Amino acid sequence: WTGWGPWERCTAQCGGGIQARRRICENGPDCAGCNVEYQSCNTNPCPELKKTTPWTPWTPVHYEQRFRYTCKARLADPNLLEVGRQRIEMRYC
Amino acid sequence: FWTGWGPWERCTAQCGGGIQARRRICENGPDCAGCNVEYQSCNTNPCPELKKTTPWTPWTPVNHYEQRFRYTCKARLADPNLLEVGRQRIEMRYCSSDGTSGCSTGTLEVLF
């Protein structure tokens, strides 16, 4: 066996991944041991990415009020977090 | 000599790519002519788009009809515990004696 190679690219930036190192056994078809080794990488929990919903329209209570929420997700990419459309529910008085 | 291969065991992740491991044992030997553990990909399907609903806003009149609002938080994750909705943030304002003024009629401009 040759010297073990450096650990390659980690799969994910956070929340668990795998990192690989490899080696080659020159002039040997079946050598002693494994040519490839794996390890866990970036085992830190992913940051709690957050996005805010749009404000609701102003409605009277003379005071007028409106509301918004925040969508919190443990993600490695903000593009994987999205806020859906506004749902209006109406009934008569 | 190597013994029979073991089961593929457990996938690393539920979705988005993982590794499954199976093993064997070199009987009466420290160094057999192979690798004791074998890997294969598992659960390469993309993770589902989980959706959670925000709490409803209080019912409010329109002008007689009453309305309320909510949104949906969508995230591609393998675990629902990693998606949550934050606290409701309320912003108010004063409409004063006009009932409108800055709330609805903006800046009243009169030309004399």
Numbering used by the authors:
A (entry chain A): 656 to 716, 724 to 755
B (entry chain B): 655 to 717, 724 to 772
Give the authors' words.
Semaphorin-5A (Sema5A) is a bifunctional guidance cue exerting attractive and inhibitory effects on neuronal growth through the interaction with heparan sulfate (HS) and chondroitin sulfate (CS) glycosaminoglycans (GAGs), respectively. TSRs are a unique feature of Sema5s and enable interactions with heparan sulfate (HS) and chondroitin sulfate (CS) glycosaminoglycan (GAG) chains linked to the protein core of proteoglycans.
The novel architecture of TSR4 supports two symmetrically positioned ~20 × 20 Å-sized shallow cavities on the opposing sides of the Sema5A dimer. The conformational flexibility of these residues is consistent with an adaptable binding site that can accommodate GAG binding partners in vivo.
